[PDB]
């Protein structure tokens, strides 16, 4: 989890081939709400494809999935049992001779 | 050429006029519409440049402006 924060900190953001927001005309609003968003895009996939299933972002390798010691004692202390152990020192104590 | 066509008159004269329509030109163009300061000098180089006239001009979308350089794109509501 570490080496993978590690790398998406790598990837944190769209290195390369950024949202191509290109405002046109300011078109004259004599009627509706300048709402411009939906014509541009729909009128950008039309053009475009852009969904035609071959381009990639590809801001980052998705591999080099480097390891290090340098998260790996975040282990701290670990919630192991045995803190208290008098039950599994009598269990070894059922063997102290070879019987069972 | 070919050498005959279909045809109708549209009787009764009714004809939509459209909600909106999108223009796309070439930057030189563009740019020269763009930086005028008010509406009717774009309107009326429009009209000049393109030979558009208001209420009597029929347009479809997709129609050619000039071949490597303008074209009309989408009309609304109807196409």
């Given at each position: 989890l570490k080496s993978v924060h590690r790398w998406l900190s790598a990837a944190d953001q769209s290195e390369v081939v950024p949202g191509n927001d290109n405002i046109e005309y300011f078109s004259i609003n004599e009627h509706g709400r300048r709402e411009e968003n939906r014509l541009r895009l729909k009128t950008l996939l039309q053009q475009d494809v852009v969904h035609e299933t071959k381009t990639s972002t590809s801001a980052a390798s998705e591999l080099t999935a480097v390891v290090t010691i340098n998260d790996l004692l975040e282990a701290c202390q670990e919630t192991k049992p045995?803190?208290?152990?008098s039950e599994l020192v009598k269990l070894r104590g059922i063997y102290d001779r070879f019987q069972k | 050429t070919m050498d005959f066509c279909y045809f109708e008159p549209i009787l009764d004269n009714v004809v939509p006029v459209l909600d909106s329509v999108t223009f796309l030109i070439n930057e030189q163009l563009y740019s020269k519409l763009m930086d005028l300061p008010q509406e009717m000098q774009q309107i009326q180089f429009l009209h000049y440049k393109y030979n558009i006239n208001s209420m009597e001009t029929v347009v479809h979308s997709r129609d050619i402006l000039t071949s490597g350089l303008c074209q009309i794109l989408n009309c609304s509501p109807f196409p």
């Open positions: 045995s803190i208290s152990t | -």
